[PDB]
Design a binder for this molecule. Structure first.
Ligand SMILES: [Zn+2]
Lengths: 300, 347, 107, 156, 82, 76, 92
C-alpha cells in the first residue's frame, strides 16, 4: 500500500462535483457544475475535446458503455440528451420542478432515471422520452439513484436513512432499512452483487448495510464525513480494498477486515468531494471543490 | 392475476395477431395491410413501425436472440425482420399459404412452418434444404405440428386423431396414439401449446373439450399407448367452442379464449376449476390472446383493439412499512420509563 | 361402488336431488336438463349467503347474539339492491326503518 | 451553481356503520403535492364519514420527550393534538392516517364526537366529494407544492 | 356508425302536446329536461329485457314479440301486436 | 412378492405384495410406507394404464417386475 | 307424516359465514319462505322462456337467462359467476 500521485487535472471555473470512471478504462470527464464537461483522460489526463454550452451547473452527469453518451442533471430543471460527437440538443426532459440532482443509464443501457428533490422523479426512455410516472421515492429529497448488476433494482437515499430498493418492472420496493441515527444520507449505492448498501450516517460512522437483515458487516473508523458530500467506492483489482473520500485534505484508502488507519495520503487543498475506482488496475482519482479546482490521479 | 379493465390501445386499427419475446418488453401487433406495429410497455411508446407488406400478415414468431422475427401472409412470403432499423434480411416467395411459424428455441437456424394443405416441413434460414416430416395418412389436409419446450422433439397432430412424435432433426418414430374423443367419432386438432417450465401441454380439440397431457407420461407411453389426460376442461353451461389457448408464466393457469362471446376463462393446472371469467366490450368477436411470461397481464385482439388487463395492486404498495402495525382501540403501554459475519460484498 | 351425494360432488351446501325432484314434480316443463338443478342450487346458496352476511353484521351491531326478524328487516331495507328485489314484501314482526322527514324538527 | 458544493445546512350507529367499512372506504392512493395523499374509488357523499384520528395517547408531559424523539430517525412529522390533556401519536404503532396532506383549499375540517372511552376526533362530510379528490384538512395551529386556485401556499 | 345525441331530439313542442293530451293547462320550464330524463330511464328498462330475450333466442333482430314480452314482465300488458 | 416402480425421480421402491392382491391394496401399501395418497400411482406396463378394479393377474404380471409411475393430482 | 324444510341448510350456511351466531325460529321460517319464493320466481321465468322458444327442455342456459333477467345488476353479475363455477366443478 504505497499509492503515489501521478497527474493533476486543473482548469475549472466552478467547483468539481464528481469523478466516475469508465467501465473498461476509457475516459474521465470533468463532471462538474461549472457549465463545462471537458473530456479528460483516466491514464494521463489526456484532453480530448470541449463539450459545453450549458445554462446552469450540472449536479452530476451520466455515463455510457462507450463512456460517451450523457444526459445533463443541471440545475436549470431541464435535461438534454447528449452525445460526444454531436453537440446538439436531441430532446428535452420535462417534469422536474427543482434541482435535478442525479440521473443514470442502467447497465443494460435502456433507462434514464432522473432524481429530484420535491419527489418529481420520473424514469425516462432513452429513445423517445415521454412523460410516464411521478414516483413517491421517499418522504425526503432524493440524494442517490443507482441500478444494480443486472438492472431490475433501484436504490435511493433519503434524509432519514431510507434504503428503498425500488423495483424496475413493477414499481413497488421491497424492504425498509433503518439506523438509530437520523441520517441525512448523501449517497447510497449497490455492490457487485446488489446485497450490501453503504449509506451515510453522519457521526463519523458510515455503515455497509445488508439486503435482507438490514444489519451492518463492519463499521469503519477514522473517517471524516458529517456535513459534506463524499462518494463511496470499493476495489477489486488485487485483494480487498476500501477507498473513500475525505474532508481534511487526505485520500482515504483502507482495507475491509482491518477497520484501522493504515493509509492516508496528503496532497489536496480542499474537502474531497469525490473519489472513484477502476476494475482491473489501481487507477484512482480524487476530486475536490472550488478551493482546490483539481482532480488528482493516483496509482500504486 | 388479472382482474380489471386497466386500459386499452387506440393506436393503429386492424390488429390481427401478436406474441412476445422471452423478456416481455415489446408487442408485435400484426396488421391487415401488411404491417407490424411495435409498442412498448414500461415506456408506453411505439418505437418502430415496419410497413412490411400489403397483405394480411397471419403468423408471427420471436426468436431467442432478440433480433429475428418470422412471418407470412397471403403475400405467401416467409419474411424476416430486425428491430434495429427494419431490415428485411430474407424473402421466401412460396406457394401453399401459411398458418403458423415456429423456431427451434436455441438452434434458431431451424424454423417450423405449417402450410395450408400438406404436412409441416421444417424450413431453414439460409438454404432451401427443407426436411420432410413424414405424415402417413395425408388425406386429412390440415395437420399441425410443433416442438417441445427445449426443442428436444417434434410433436404432430392430424385431423383424424392420431398423434405422432419425431426427433427434432432425424425423425425417430417414438410415440403413437389416437385421442380418446367420444366413443365412435374422433375429432381434429387446432393448436398445441407449451410452457416455459415443465413439459405439460394442452390439446385443443374440436368437440369443445381441452385435454392436457405431460411429456414424461407420453414418453412412458410411447409407441401404441393410451395416455389418459391430466385434466379435462370444458364449459357445459354456455356451450362454447374454442379459438386459441395458451399457458401461464409457470404453466399453472390455462388461459383459453372464446370464439363467440369476447370472454376469457382461466383455470388451474392442479385443481382444474374455473377461477375468474374476464369481460370487455360485449359487441366484439375475439381472435388472438397473448400471455405475458414474467408478469401476468393479458392482451386481447378483436376489431383492432388491444387491451391491457392488470390487477392494479389494490391490496396496497407496502414499500415503506413492513413495520408500524395498527392498533384499533387506543392501546397504551405507558408504564415504561427507560461484526458477526463476513460475506463477499465485492461478489 | 360408493355413493357421493351430488352436493359434495359439486362443493355446495344446498341439496341437489331435492331441487331436481321439485323441478320434475311441479310441471314446469316436460324434460329437465342435467346442469339446471346444480346451477339453481348455486344461485339460491349465494342469495342466502348475501342476506345472512348483512343480518349477522347488524346483529353484532346491536350487541345481541342471535338473529330476530328486526335484524332481517334492517339488513334488507338498509341495502340497495335487495330493496329492489324485495320491493313488495312485508316481513312479519318487522317494523320500519327509523325515518323522519326534514321540516318536522324545530330549528 | 450547485447544491452539492453547498453543504446541507343516531350519530353513533351510522358512525359504527362507517367503522364496519374501513377497508371499504378508500385505498391508500397518492397525491402529487408531496408523495402520497388520499383519493377515493367512490364518490364520498354529503354527511359521509371518513376517518378517525387514533393511535398512541401521549400524556400531559411525554411530548417534552417526544420532541427529543423527533431528533432521532426524524420519526413524527405527523402531528394532531387531542386536547390540553393529551396528544395522539401515529408514528410507532397506531393510526396509519399519517399521509393526509394539506392544500390551502382543504375539503375537510376537524370535529369531536365523544364516546365513553373519551373524546374522539371524528370526520364527516358536508358535500358530495367526487371520485379521486384529495381529502385534506385545515391546520389552524415550508411552502406547499400543489398549485391551487386562490392558494395561500402555507400550512394553516 | 356511432351516434352522439337525440336525447335532445325529443323536441320541446312534442312534450307540450303530450301534456295537452294529458289535460294540462300551464307548464313551467324545467319540465322539459326532467321529462327527457324520465323517458330515457323507462326506455332503458324496456330495452334491457328486449335485448336479453334476443340474445337468448340466438338471433340478431329485435322482434316486436319481445317488446310485448318485456312489457308483460314490467306489468303493462300491450294489446295489438301479437 | 417384491416389485419395483420407476417413478419420475428414479425412486425404485420396495414393497411387501403378493400374487393375490388388487391394485388399490398395493397403492395403499405405498400410502402406508410413504404418505402419498393412492389417487395417482399409475403402474405402467409397456406404456399403458392399469385400472384400480383388477387383480395382479388381470394383466399377466410376472412377479418381481419393474414398473413405472406418473404423478397425478387426482385430488382435483 | 314427514314435512320438508330448509332449516339444516340455513344452519350450515350461517355457520360457514359466521362462527358463533345463533338464529331463532322466526327468522328460520322467514328464510324458508324466502328460498321458496325465489325458487318459484326463477322456475317461472325459466318455463316461460322454454315455451317462447318452442323448446321442451329446461337446461342451465335458461336458468342463466332467467337469473340475468330477474336480479338487478350487481347481484346478477355475482350470481352468474357463482353458478358457472359450480357447474364446472360439477363436471369433473
Ligand atoms: Zn394549496
Amino acid at each position: 500500500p504505497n499509492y503515489a500521485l501521478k497527474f493533476t487535472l486543473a482548469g475549472h471555473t466552478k467547483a468539481v462535483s464528481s469523478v466516475k470512471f469508465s467501465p473498461n478504462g476509457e475516459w474521465l470527464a470533468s463532471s462538474s457544475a461549472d457549465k463545462l464537461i471537458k473530456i479528460w483522460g483516466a491514464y494521463d489526463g489526456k484532453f480530448e475535446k470541449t463539450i459545453s454550452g450549458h445554462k446552469l451547473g450540472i449536479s452530476d452527469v451520466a455515463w455510457s458503455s462507450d463512456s460517451n453518451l450523457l444526459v445533463s442533471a443541471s440545475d436549470d430543471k431541464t435535461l438534454k440528451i447528449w452525445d460526444v460527437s454531436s453537440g446538439k440538443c436531441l430532446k428535452t426532459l420535462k417534469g422536474h420542478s427543482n434541482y435535478v440532482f442525479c440521473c443514470n443509464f442502467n447497465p443494460q443501457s435502456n433507462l434514464i432515471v432522473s432524481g429530484s428533490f420535491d419527489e418529481s422523479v420520473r424514469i425516462w426512455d432513452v429513445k423517445t422520452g415521454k412523460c410516464l410516472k411521478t414516483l413517491p421515492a421517499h418522504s425526503d429529497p432524493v440524494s442517490a439513484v443507482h441500478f444494480n448488476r443486472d438492472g431490475s433494482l433501484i436504490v435511493s437515499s433519503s434524509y432519514d436513512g431510507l434504503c428503498r430498493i425500488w423495483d424496475t418492472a413493477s414499481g413497488q420496493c421491497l424492504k425498509t432499512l433503518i439506523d438509530d441515527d437520523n441520517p441525512p444520507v448523501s449517497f447510497v449505492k449497490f455492490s457487485p452483487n446488489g446485497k450490501y448498501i453503504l449509506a451515510a450516517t453522519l457521526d463519523n460512522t458510515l455503515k455497509l448495510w445488508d439486503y435482507s437483515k438490514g444489519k451492518c458487516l463492519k463499521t469503519y473508523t477514522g473517517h471524516k464525513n458529517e456535513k459534506y458530500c463524499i462518494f463511496a467506492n470499493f476495489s477489486v483489482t488485487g485483494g480487498k480494498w476500501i477507498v473513500s473520500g475525505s474532508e481534511d485534505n487526505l485520500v482515504y484508502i483502507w482495507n475491509l477486515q482491518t477497520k484501522e488507519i493504515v493509509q492516508k495520503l496528503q496532497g489536496h487543498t480542499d474537502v474531497v468531494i469525490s473519489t472513484a475506482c477502476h476494475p482491473t488496475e489501481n487507477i484512482i482519482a480524487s476530486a475536490a471543490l472550488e478551493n482546490d479546482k483539481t482532480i488528482k490521479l493516483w496509482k500504486s | 392475476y388479472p382482474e380489471e379493465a386497466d386500459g386499452t390501445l387506440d393506436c393503429i386499427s386492424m390488429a390481427l395477431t401478436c406474441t412476445f419475446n422471452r423478456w416481455g418488453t415489446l408487442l408485435a401487433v400484426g396488421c391487415n395491410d401488411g404491417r407490424i406495429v411495435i409498442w412498448d410497455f414500461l415506456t408506453r411508446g411505439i418505437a418502430k413501425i415496419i410497413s412490411a407488406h400489403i397483405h394480411p400478415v397471419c403468423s408471427l414468431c420471436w426468436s431467442r436472440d432478440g433480433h429475428k422475427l418470422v412471418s407470412a401472409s397471403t403475400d405467401n412470403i416467409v419474411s424476416q425482420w430486425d428491430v434495429l432499423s427494419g431490415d428485411c434480411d430474407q424473402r421466401f416467395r412460396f406457394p401453399s399459404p401459411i398458418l403458423k411459424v415456429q423456431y427451434h428455441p436455441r438452434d434458431q437456424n431451424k424454423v417450423l412452418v405449417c402450410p395450408m394443405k400438406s404436412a409441416p416441413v421444417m424450413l431453414t434460414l439460409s438454404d432451401s434444404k427443407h426436411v420432410v416430416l413424414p405424415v402417413d395418412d395425408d388425406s386429412d389436409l390440415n395437420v399441425v405440428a410443433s416442438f417441445d419446450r427445449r426443442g428436444e422433439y417434434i410433436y404432430t397432430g392430424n385431423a383424424k386423431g392420431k398423434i405422432l412424435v419425431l426427433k427434432t432433426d432425424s425423425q425417430d418414430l417414438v410415440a403413437s396414439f389416437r385421442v380418446t374423443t367420444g366413443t365412435s367419432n374422433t375429432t381434429a386438432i387446432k393448436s398445441i401449446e407449451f410452457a416455459r417450465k415443465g413439459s405439460c401441454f394442452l390439446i385443443n380439440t374440436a368437440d369443445r373439450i381441452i385435454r392436457v397431457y405431460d411429456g414424461r407420461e407420453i414418453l412412458t407411453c410411447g409407441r401404441d399407448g393410451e395416455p389418459e389426460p391430466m385434466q379435462k376442461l370444458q364449459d357445459l353451461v354456455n356451450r362454447t367452442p374454442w379459438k386459441k389457448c395458451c399457458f401461464s408464466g409457470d404453466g399453472e393457469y390455462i388461459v383459453a379464449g372464446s370464439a363467440r362471446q369476447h370472454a376469457l376463462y382461466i383455470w388451474e393446472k392442479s385443481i382444474g376449476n374455473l377461477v375468474k371469467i374476464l369481460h370487455g366490450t360485449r359487441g366484439e368477436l375475439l381472435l388472438d390472446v397473448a400471455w405475458h411470461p414474467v408478469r401476468p397481464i393479458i392482451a386481447s385482439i378483436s376489431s383492432g383493439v388491444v387491451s391491457i388487463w392488470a390487477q392494479n395492486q389494490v391490496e396496497n404498495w407496502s414499500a415503506f412499512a413492513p413495520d408500524f402495525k395498527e392498533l384499533d382501540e387506543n392501546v397504551e403501554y405507558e408504564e415504561r420509563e427507560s461484526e458477526d459475519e463476513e460475506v463477499d460484498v465485492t461478489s | 361402488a360408493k355413493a357421493k351425494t351430488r352436493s359434495s360432488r359439486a362443493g355446495l351446501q344446498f341439496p341437489v336431488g331435492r331441487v331436481h325432484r321439485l323441478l320434475r314434480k311441479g310441471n314446469y316443463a316436460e324434460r329437465v336438463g342435467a346442469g339446471a338443478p346444480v346451477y339453481l342450487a348455486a344461485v339460491l346458496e349465494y342469495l342466502t349467503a348475501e342476506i345472512l352476511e348483512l343480518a349477522g353484521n347488524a346483529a353484532r351491531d346491536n350487541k345481541k347474539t342471535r338473529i330476530i326478524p328486526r335484524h332481517l328487516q334492517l339488513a334488507v331495507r338498509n341495502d340497495e339492491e335487495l330493496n329492489k328485489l324485495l320491493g313488495r314484501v312485508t316481513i312479519a314482526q318487522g317494523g320500519v326503518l327509523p325515518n323522519i322527514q326534514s321540516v318536522l324538527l324545530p330549528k | 451553481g450547485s447544491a452539492r458544493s453547498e453543504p446541507k445546512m343516531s350519530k353513533s350507529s351510522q358512525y359504527r356503520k362507517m367503522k364496519t367499512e374501513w377497508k371499504s372506504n378508500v385505498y391508500l392512493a397518492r397525491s402529487r403535492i408531496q408523495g402520497l395523499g388520499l383519493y377515493a374509488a367512490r364518490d364520498i357523499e354529503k354527511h359521509t364519514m371518513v376517518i378517525e384520528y387514533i393511535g398512541t395517547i401521549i400524556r400531559n408531559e411525554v411530548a417534552n420527550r417526544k420532541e427529543k424523539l423527533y431528533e432521532s430517525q426524524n420519526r413524527g412529522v405527523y402531528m394532531f393534538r387531542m386536547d390540553n390533556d393529551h396528544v395522539i401519536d401515529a408514528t410507532l404503532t397506531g393510526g396509519p392516517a399519517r399521509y393526509i396532506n394539506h392544500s390551502c383549499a382543504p375539503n375537510c375540517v376537524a370535529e369531536v364526537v365523544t364516546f365513553e372511552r373519551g373524546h374522539k376526533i371524528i370526520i364527516s362530510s358536508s358535500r358530495r366529494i367526487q371520485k379521486g379528490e384529495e381529502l385534506c384538512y385545515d391546520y389552524k395551529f415550508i411552502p406547499c407544492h400543489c398549485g391551487a386556485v386562490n392558494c395561500r401556499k402555507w400550512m394553516n | 356508425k356511432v351516434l352522439r345525441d337525440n336525447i335532445q331530439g325529443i323536441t320541446k313542442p312534442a312534450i307540450r302536446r303530450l301534456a295537452r293530451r294529458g289535460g294540462v293547462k300551464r307548464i313551467s320550464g324545467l319540465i322539459y329536461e326532467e321529462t327527457r330524463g324520465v323517458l330515457k330511464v323507462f326506455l332503458e328498462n324496456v330495452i334491457r329485457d328486449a335485448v336479453t330475450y334476443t340474445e337468448h333466442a340466438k338471433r340478431k333482430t329485435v322482434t316486436a314479440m319481445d317488446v310485448v314480452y318485456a312489457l308483460k314482465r314490467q306489468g303493462r300488458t300491450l294489446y295489438g301486436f301479437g | 412378492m417384491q416389485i419395483f416402480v420407476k417413478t419420475l425421480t428414479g425412486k425404485t421402491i420396495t414393497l411387501e405384495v403378493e400374487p393375490s392382491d388388487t391394485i388399490e391394496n398395493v397403492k395403499a401399501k405405498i400410502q402406508d410406507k410413504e404418505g402419498i395418497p393412492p389417487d395417482q400411482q399409475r403402474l405402467i406396463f409397456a406404456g399403458k394404464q392399469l385400472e384400480d378394479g383388477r387383480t395382479l393377474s388381470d394383466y399377466n404380471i410376472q412377479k418381481e417386475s419393474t414398473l413405472h409411475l406418473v404423478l397425478r393430482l387426482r385430488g382435483c | 307424516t314427514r314435512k320438508e324444510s330448509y332449516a339444516i341448510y340455513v344452519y350450515k350456511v350461517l355457520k360457514q359465514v359466521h362462527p358463533d351466531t345463533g338464529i331463532s325460529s322466526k327468522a328460520m321460517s322467514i328464510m324458508n319462505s324466502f328460498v321458496n319464493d325465489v325458487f318459484e320466481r326463477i322456475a317461472g321465468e325459466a318455463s316461460r322462456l322454454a315455451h317462447y322458444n318452442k323448446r321442451s327442455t329446461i337446461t342451465s342456459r335458461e336458468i342463466q337467462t332467467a337469473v340475468r333477467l330477474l336480479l338487478p345488476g350487481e347481484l346478477a353479475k355475482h350470481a352468474v359467476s357463482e353458478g358457472t363455477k359450480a357447474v364446472t366443478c360439477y363436471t369433473s
